[PDB]
Ligand binder design. Structure first.
Ligand SMILES: COc1ccc(S(=O)(=O)N(CC(C)C)C[C@@H](O)[C@H](C[C@]23C[C@H]4C[C@H](C[C@H](C4)C2)C3)NC(=O)O[C@H]2CO[C@H]3OCCC[C@H]32)cc1
Ligand SMILES: [Cl-]
Ligand SMILES: [Cl-]
Ligand code: NA
Ligand code: NA
Ligand code: NA
Lengths: 99, 99
């Protein structure tokens, strides 16, 4: 699809068996999901944006379905009010910014 | 252009006659630029980033060129890890997300 930017670019995702709403975010290097359990190994990470940093858990090799398109990659889990699909997974679904 | 997301989508902007680098950020509602001098009056705004809430200076109706495309709109001035072009100006330059 072609998604307009008149509104936040929100899509449905599936991760860890759960359906969630997430923001397609070209400004995010990495994907950041609100607190949830994921299987496997993880390690701590700090990520920074406006207002400073948050601590997250980094899970590698996690599959996400994004608006119907499957992708695999690293997923960060931590205290965000909105799920963020970052560039590491946007590339895998072929997303581009066009103007 | 059609911009892929394997690297950060950085562009050159021109504001106040000065060239700056900025990130095209579909996860940003607003445009936020590092401390600089702009004309006219400003109004207060609180924005909530991943790390918390910060105060910025809101300048309305500012002339800004983004990757060669002319825009005139609101610019927030304050401490950001990188200059970000948010949806208020991405819509002026005609940007969409596509996959
Ligand atoms: C290394 O990988 C990472 C490291 C950092 C992040 S980041 O911090 O989230 N950020 C990175 C940017 C700031 C370089 C993505 C950005 O797109 C956020 C995204 C985000 C994501 C959720 C929901 C909201 C509030 C915050 C949490 C930040 C928008 N937007 C935002 O700061 O926007 C403000 C401007 O205009 C206003 O709109 C409304 C929100 C505040 C400002 C993500 C992955
Ligand atoms: Cl990855
Ligand atoms: Cl590609
Ligand atoms: Na893993
Ligand atoms: Na000033
Ligand atoms: Na003004």
């Amino acid at each position: 699809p072609q998604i307009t930017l008149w509104k936040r670019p929100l899509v449905t995702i599936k991760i860890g068996g759960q359906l969630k709403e997430a923001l397609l975010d070209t400004g995010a290097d990495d994907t950041v999901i609100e607190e949830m359990s994921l299987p496997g190994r993880w390690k701590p990470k700090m990520i920074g944006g406006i207002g400073g940093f948050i601590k997250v858990r980094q899970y590698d090799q996690i599959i996400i379905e994004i608006a119907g398109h499957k992708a695999i990659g690293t997923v960060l889990v931590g205290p965000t009010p909105v799920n963020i699909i970052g560039r590491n997974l946007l590339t895998q679904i072929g997303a581009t910014l066009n103007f």
